[PDB]
Design a protein around this nucleic acid. Structure first.
Lengths: 5, 5
DNA sequence: GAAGCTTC
DNA sequence: GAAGCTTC
């Protein structure tokens, strides 16, 4: 994902 | 990333 | 270098 | 299952 989430 | 980008 | 989820 | 970048 993101980086992060 | 995303999904997608 | 661990650290990943959901496109399509 | 190919398909990934940038945190920290």
């Amino acid at each position: 994902t993101x980086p992060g989430v």
